[PDB]
């Protein structure tokens, strides 16, 4: 009912902002008790948020907001499989994808776990038949190269986990001599990329789309399918392509054997689908189902933590509340995902979808237009790369609250005899310094104390008091990757719950699809039928006229591949 | 003075109220307006009609450009004046792509002869290198090049290289060759860069303006050890070369002095890809002529930017529109949305080019700014980003978009009987998304479509969200160079209007200082058993948790990855 911004709690936090404005992190970060309070910890995951612009009172005030917004009830309702995605009338149960074989989670009156495990075991059997060479090509060779075709939550989530497992010793071993490539873009350049240095006879294709109607994926699906027939023949399709989708009737009609189709469900959000067959199938072909099952158990471990742990100890809850604090009360429109791991390189792009597609919303879940903005702009690059890209602005331009992620045990440790510190230790020294640099700044007195020329002190000042939080992880293997993923899936839902919006819908994408089909029809009529450009505004008409002024080089209606 | 105090600024400020009384879905019917809010140069067409503005808005920006002496600052830049007042340096990345006869003076000395001297040196080496004549220690010719560097020594080259990888001319000149980038100090990135590489057939290029950047030098000494450990300590003068401003330090590293390639203090890191920073590794992958066509692309914009009147001046218009969106419409972020997979690494370079130049808190005179300046930049290629964060751009926070599309596909693909070619399928998104953000979709339309009254609010698009569009004739080396040059000059324009130094980077120092202090602590604790001391309580604990885990390798013993 009531907009959260109307509640006394919400206004109580707005009064609190003026009090925090009177404080500076240079002083707050000497308080042992404050800084010890503003931590939390679960297994290999340590979270230090002492560098937020916050006191324990802020956190206490944030907790009564969470009660006033009924955060605990909303979390249980999700876990209980209630249809909280009200605008699509759907359950929201990514957690059921990693729930234990004995769990009971009902959607639409049926327990969905036994069917969740139905797919897992089918993927396991296929994965063993695949990796052991008994699944052969048309020229009889065993397949070693997998192209996953998909976009959005059918792409970014799996890419993230694949890039994180690539350099973990255990997984890397299990994936010896095997490739996993992702065809996402419809740009035919991406198509050329994903098939470069590849053999149709040795390549398996997996088509991932919750719908099997998505325009870019299905054209990719049809394009790569022809690459296979060009080189192997019309029957090769059955042994060289498989699919993951909610709608298997559409998979049958695409020409894929119905027993080579691995299902997931409409209560699996796209941007929450990596734990479903979307990611488990392709990751299991690369790293084997043992490695992937570890990733699931990690994710499952945070699901239990998020569902049952009190709010002072609850990492997803703390993260989401501090994010609302930064966004809606301190007014920070962006947020930086800065992990000190090249293995986590593809983490920010996935958080981008998960975060902005969930909470880039203008109305409450009941349809009331929000009087405030919800949904931060997420970006990042891994440290230390980002340090030499944009941290200049983070220190001296617009204030951007940061997520620092560091890992203790290196995946690929390096030391040279005589070096002051190991390579991984060099990396981590910035991980420990940057958040303190952001908190304390450097005063002009401190600069003039160091005989810095007066004309430069202005340019060398750091204001400090810029906020940050630090994850410190035990290691970065499949289990922990899954824990990281679960922590952000649940953090985004918490921001959405506090904001009182539908984190789990995506209507903002419908208009671009409509107009693109209107343009597509204009492009067919002009290319194939020579029909003028008609029905567009004068800018669009000129641009289309420029585009179509370049007539194709290919003989009419003739197939061309790279 | 201070730009925010001038009448031109206050006029533009009230002008916002008039623009707020318009809506793009009307403004876009005006053929006079749409035609006027464009600009064009060679195969580069700019349509900015979808900006929240009129020709009068642009008129008023021009009078701000006048009060700001924009024309002047561009001329001083081009003439070689040391406009980088805080470091007392010229700003002459223009001179890297100048012709031999050009007269560009820094400190009374013409710099062009030295520019072309390095250039001629690179070409000579790249013929030698690519011919196979240059061999390794085992006598085999060198196939693969690894480029070690960070930030400016990294991002521009990576962008240009990703773009050329699929260009059919460049790809042909690059066959059989690899060019990889080692950038992070994270030893995972070392393991990745040397994965499947043989040091016998590998050449290493060390790029750093200072040759003292901690991450690059450790990676450099790390990859040196990789080479000596396989091919002997003599193999170094054969397998390692360097790019930098300091050659004494390059000799000290242990690299043959005539295997050093200079550039100069008036080349910013984020403006350095047209120097040997980019020209050298790119010439090795693609041949020097391909790289020469890129430099010529950059050069054409330089002349266009320097001479063209403001209403035809593409970088001037871009920079003023971006200032308009930032300082008057209030938009904190900007999206780089190339509808090209080959431009996949464009946005990461623009992040650095823009946010390090313009993320500043004081004027070029050290006056504190009463408004904020440099915007947060980010992007993904279309249509990828479409299925990631566009939900927010349509229905959440407003984010001005740069859309970039290309007429001719680098990699055209067509299937007989498909309604459109794959590149045309890509482009109908490129043409639809701007219109969809400009027009919106009202509840009235939705009710007129029999959308249930309870779903109308969730499916509403407000429209009047700004975007601009670039249409490129092709994406060959020449056009990549033009795109590069457009953005370098746009960012400068913005800094000039704002009155800030787009060319220093003091905001990075404080993180460097405290990271040294951490590096000292880690050595003291790893090698000397010293306790943790001199950190705040949060940092003390984080460091103890990290040191708790001892490395599994014997003391002072060299370990490499995989
Ligand atoms: O999984 P698909 O049916 O292929 O749909 C692909 C989808 O990826 C994500 O889920 C996004 O939310 C959508 O913007 C996109 O349409
Ligand atoms: O170019 P280098 O000497 O390696 O310097 C690396 C540099 O990255 C960018 O170019 C920036 O100028 C700094 O953030 C950093 O110092």
**Other CB atoms within 10 Å distance of the CB of residue A253:** 10
Q: Which chain A positions have a beta carbon within 8 Å of B188's beta carbon?
A: 167, 341-343, 410-412
Record the tokens describing residue B522, joined without a space.
Answer: 């880690």
Nearby residues of B169 by Cβ (< 8 Å), 6 or more positions away: B290, B476, B477
The continuous run of DSSP H or E covering A71 comes out as helix A71-79
Give strand pairing partners of A462.
Answer: A442
Nearby residues of A454 by Cβ (< 8 Å), 6 or more positions away: A448
d(CA A94, CA A503): 13
d(CA A234, CA B483): 43
- By annotation, the residues of A acting in catalysis are 357, 388, 513
- CA–centroid distance, residue B331 to ligand 2 (Å): 28
Q: How many residues does chain B have?
A: 562
CB distance A7 to A372 below 8 Å: no
* Alpha-carbon distances of A70 from A56, A62, B516, rounded to whole Å: 21, 12, 46
Are A272 and A125 in the same domain? yes
The residue behind tokens 């070392």 is B190
Which residue of B lies nearest to A384 if distances are taken between CA atoms?
B184
**Domain ends where: A293, A310, A325?**
A293
> What method did the depositors use to determine the structure?
X-ray
Give strand pairing partners of B243.
Answer: B207, B261
d(CA A540, CA A534): 10
Which three-class secondary structure state does DSSP give residue A417? coil
Pocket flag, ligand 1, residue A211 (CB < 6 Å): yes
Atom of ligand 2 nearest to the CA of B211: 3
Nearby residues of B244 by Cβ (< 8 Å), 6 or more positions away: B206, B207, B208, B209, B210, B211, B250, B260, B262, B263
Name the strands in the sheet holding B44-47, side by side, starting at the edge strand that comes first in the sequence.
Answer: B38-41, B44-47, B467-472, B401-406, B333-338, B376-379
Q: What are phi and psi of B367, to 5 degrees?
A: -70, 135
Q: Is there a cis peptide before residue A384, judged by omega within 30 degrees of 0?
A: yes
Whether A193 and chain B come into contact, CB under 8 Å, resolves to yes
CB distance A398 to B374 below 8 Å: yes
CB distance A3 to A371 below 8 Å: yes
DSSP A533: P
d(CA B378, CA A379): 7
Q: Which chain B positions have a beta carbon within 8 Å of A508's beta carbon?
A: 390-396, 461
- CA–centroid distance, residue A411 to ligand 2 (Å): 26
* Alpha-carbon distances of A513 from A192, A363, A518, B341, B435, rounded to whole Å: 24, 21, 9, 20, 12
Give strand pairing partners of B362.
Answer: B368
Is residue B387 flagged as an active site residue? yes
Chosen for mutation from A273, A511, A546 (greatest number of chain B CBs closer than 10 Å) is A511
d(CA B538, CA A150): 43
Which three-class secondary structure state does DSSP give residue B308? coil
Nearby residues of B25 by Cβ (< 8 Å), 6 or more positions away: B438, B439, B440, B463, B464
Q: What are phi and psi of B241, to 5 degrees?
A: -135, 170
CB distance B518 to A433 below 8 Å: yes
**Domain ends where: B508, B523, B543?**
B508
Pocket flag, ligand 1, residue B387 (CB < 6 Å): yes
CA A212 to chain centre: 21
Are A328 and A441 in the same domain? yes
Are A239 and A276 in the same domain? yes
In total, how many domains does chain A have? 3
Four-point Cα dihedral B191, B192, B197, B201, nearest 10: -100
Are A316 and A184 in the same domain? no
The β-bridge relationship of strands B144-148 and B178-182 is parallel
d(CA A362, CA A375): 9
Which three-class secondary structure state does DSSP give residue B58? helix
Give strand pairing partners of A145.
Answer: A179, A203
Is residue B512 flagged as an active site residue? yes
d(CA A360, CA A426): 37
Q: Convert A260-278 to b/e letters by CB count within 10 Å (16 or more is b).
A: ebbbbbebbbbbbbbbbbb
Are B499 and B401 in the same domain? yes
Whether B443 and chain A come into contact, CB under 8 Å, resolves to no
Are B286 and B332 in the same domain? no
Which residue of A lies nearest to B366 if distances are taken between CA atoms?
A458
- Who among B441, B545, B552 is closest to A46 (CB)? B545
The residue behind tokens 């910013």 is B268
Closest CA to A241 of A265, A219, A216, A224: A224
Q: What are phi and psi of B385, to 5 degrees?
A: -60, -25
**Other CB atoms within 10 Å distance of the CB of residue A428:** 28
Whether A56 and chain B come into contact, CB under 8 Å, resolves to no
Residues 369-388, chain A: which have Cβ within 8 Å of B? 369, 373-375, 377-379, 381-385, 387-388
CB distance B353 to B525 below 8 Å: no
d(CA B273, CA B270): 8
Whether A398 and chain B come into contact, CB under 8 Å, resolves to yes
CB contact under 8 A, B386 and A512: yes
Mutate-to-test residue for ligand 1 from A92, A154, A157, A357, highest number of ligand atoms within 8 A of CB: A154
Q: Let me know how many helices (H) and strands (E) chain A has, helices first.
A: 22, 13
Q: How many residues does chain A have?
A: 562
* Alpha-carbon distances of B509 from A430, A433, B513, B514, B559, rounded to whole Å: 12, 12, 6, 9, 31
Task: Compute the count of residue pairs across chains A and B with CB atoms less than 8 Å apart.
Answer: 515
d(CA A117, CA A113): 6
Are A505 and A437 in the same domain? yes
**Nearest-CA distance B197 → chain A (Å):** 14
d(CA A322, CA A20): 14
d(CA A382, CA A340): 5
Record the tokens describing residue B302, joined without a space.
Answer: 């330089």
Whether A466 and chain B come into contact, CB under 8 Å, resolves to no
Residue B213, phi-psi category: left (phi > 0), alpha (psi -120 to 50), beta (remainder): beta
Q: Which residues of B are annotated as a binding site for alpha-D-glucose 6-phosphate?
A: 152-153, 208-210, 213, 356, 387, 512
Which three-class secondary structure state does DSSP give residue B193? helix
**Domain ends where: B275, B292, B309?**
B292
Give strand pairing partners of B182.
Answer: B148
d(CA A480, CA A470): 16
Residues 489-528, chain B: which have Cβ within 8 Å of A? 501, 504-511, 513-519, 522-523, 526
Whether B233 and chain A come into contact, CB under 8 Å, resolves to no
d(CA A20, CA B383): 42
CA B45 to chain centre: 21
Q: Let me know how many helices (H) and strands (E) chain B has, helices first.
A: 22, 13
**Other CB atoms within 10 Å distance of the CB of residue B82:** 16
* Alpha-carbon distances of B419 from A481, B427, B486, rounded to whole Å: 42, 13, 35
Four-point Cα dihedral B317, A392, A337, A179, nearest 10: 80
The residue behind tokens 């958080």 is A351
CB contact under 8 A, A463 and B185: no
Q: Which residues of A are annotated as a binding site?
A: 153-154, 209-211, 214, 357, 388, 513
DSSP A241: E
d(CA B264, CA A132): 57
Q: Which chain A positions have a beta carbon within 8 Å of B410's beta carbon?
A: 189
Range of the domain at A122: 94-293
Are A287 and A304 in the same domain? no
d(CA B388, CA A157): 11
d(CA B62, CA B320): 8
Nearby residues of B289 by Cβ (< 8 Å), 6 or more positions away: none
Q: Which chain B positions have a beta carbon within 8 Å of A50's beta carbon?
A: 538
Are B113 and B190 in the same domain? yes
Are B42 and B63 in the same domain? yes
d(CA A260, CA A147): 15
The β-bridge relationship of strands A45-48 and A106-107 is unpaired
Record the tokens describing residue B560, joined without a space.
Answer: 């490499």
CB distance B278 to B160 below 8 Å: yes
Are B518 and B465 in the same domain? no
Nearby residues of A103 by Cβ (< 8 Å), 6 or more positions away: A96, A113
- Ligand minimally distant from the alpha carbon of residue A386: 2
CB distance B144 to B126 below 8 Å: no
d(CA A23, CA B413): 60
Q: Which chain A positions have a beta carbon within 8 Å of B543's beta carbon?
A: 432
Mutate-to-test residue for ligand 1 from A148, A185, A211, A270, highest number of ligand atoms within 8 A of CB: A270
Whether B400 and chain A come into contact, CB under 8 Å, resolves to no
Q: Convert A355-393 to b/e letters by CB count within 10 Å (16 or more is b).
A: bbbbbbbbbbbebeebeebbbbbbbbbbbbbbbbbbbbb
Which residue of A lies nearest to B35 if distances are taken between CA atoms?
A539
Atom of ligand 2 nearest to the CA of A391: 14
- CA–centroid distance, residue A209 to ligand 1 (Å): 7
- CA–centroid distance, residue B387 to ligand 1 (Å): 6
Whether A443 and chain B come into contact, CB under 8 Å, resolves to no
The continuous run of DSSP H or E covering A145 comes out as strand A145-149
**Three-state secondary structure of B69-130:** CHHHHHHHHHHCCCCECCCCECCCHHHHHCCCCCCCEECCEECHHHHHHHHHHHHHHHHHHH
CB contact under 8 A, A458 and B367: yes
- Ligand minimally distant from the alpha carbon of residue B270: 2
CB contact under 8 A, A421 and B384: no
**Three-state secondary structure of B445-475:** HHHCCCCCCCCCHHHCECCCCCEEEEEECCC
Are B424 and B528 in the same domain? no
């Amino acid at each position: 009912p009531a907009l959260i911004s109307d509640t006394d709690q919400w206004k109580a936090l707005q009064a609190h902002v003026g009090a925090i404005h009177k404080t500076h992190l240079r002083d707050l970060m000497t308080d042992a008790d404050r800084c010890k309070a503003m931590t939390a910890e679960f297994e290999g995951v340590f979270l230090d948020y002492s560098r937020q612009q916050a006191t324990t009172e802020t956190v206490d005030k944030l907790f009564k907001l969470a009660e006033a917004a009924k955060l605990k009830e909303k979390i249980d309702k999700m876990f209980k499989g209630e249809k909280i995605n009200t605008t699509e009338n759907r359950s929201v149960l990514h957690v059921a994808l990693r729930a234990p074989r004995d769990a009971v989670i009902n959607s639409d009156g049926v327990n969905v776990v036994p069917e969740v495990w139905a797919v897992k075991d089918k993927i396991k059997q296929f994965s063993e038949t695949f990796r052991s060479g008994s699944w052969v090509g048309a020229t009889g060779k065993p397949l070693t190269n997998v192209v996953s075709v998909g976009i959005g939550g059918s792409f970014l989530g799996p890419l993230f986990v694949h890039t994180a497992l690539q350099t973990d010793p255990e997984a890397a071993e299990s994936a010896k001599g095997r490739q996993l490539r992702f065809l996402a873009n419809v740009d035919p350049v991406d198509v050329a990329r994903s098939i470069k240095d590849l053999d149709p006879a040795t390549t398996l294709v997996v088509v991932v789309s919750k719908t099997f109607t998505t325009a870019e994926t299905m054209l990719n699906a049809r394009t790569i399918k022809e690459w296979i027939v060009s080189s192997l023949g019309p029957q090769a399709v059955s042994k060289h392509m498989i699919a993951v989708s909610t709608n298997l009737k559409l998979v049958k009609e695409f020409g894929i054997d119905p027993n080579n189709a691995f299902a997931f469900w409409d209560w699996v959000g796209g941007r929450y689908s990596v734990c479903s067959a979307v990611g488990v199938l392709p990751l299991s072909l690369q790293y084997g189902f043992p490695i992937v099952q570890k990733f699931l158990e990690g994710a499952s471990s945070i699901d239990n933590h998020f569902h049952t742990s009190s709010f002072e100890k609850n990492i997803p809850v703390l993260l989401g509340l501090l994010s609302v604090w930064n966004v809606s009360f301190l007014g920070y429109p962006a947020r930086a995902i800065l992990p000190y791991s090249q293995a986590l390189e593809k983490l920010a792009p996935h958080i981008q979808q998960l975060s902005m597609e969930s909470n880039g919303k203008g109305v409450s879940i009941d349809g009331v237009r929000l009087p405030y903005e919800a949904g931060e702009i997420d970006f990042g690059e891994p440290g230390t790369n980002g340090q030499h890209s944009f941290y200049q602005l983070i220190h001296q331009g617009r204030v951007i609250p940061c997520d620092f992620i560091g890992v203790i045990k290196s995946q690929q440790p390096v030391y040279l005899k005589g070096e002051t510190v190991s390579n991984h230790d060099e990396l981590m020294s910035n991980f420990f310094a940057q958040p303190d640099a952001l908190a304390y700044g450097k005063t002009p007195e401190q600069l003039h104390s160091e005989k810095v020329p007066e004309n430069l002190i202005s340019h060398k000042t750091f204001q400090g008091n810029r906020p940050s939080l630090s994850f410190l992880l035990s290691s970065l293997s499949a289990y922990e990757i899954g824990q990281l993923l679960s922590i952000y899936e649940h953090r985004i839902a918490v921001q959405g719950f506090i904001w009182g919006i539908n984190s789990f819908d995506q209507w903002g994408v419908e208009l671009g699809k409509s107009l693109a089909s209107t343009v597509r029809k204009q492009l067919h009529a002009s290319r194939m039928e020579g029909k003028p450009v008609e029905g567009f505004n004068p800018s669009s008409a000129s641009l289309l006229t420029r585009f179509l002024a370049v007539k194709p080089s290919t003989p009419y209606d003739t197939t061309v591949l790279p």
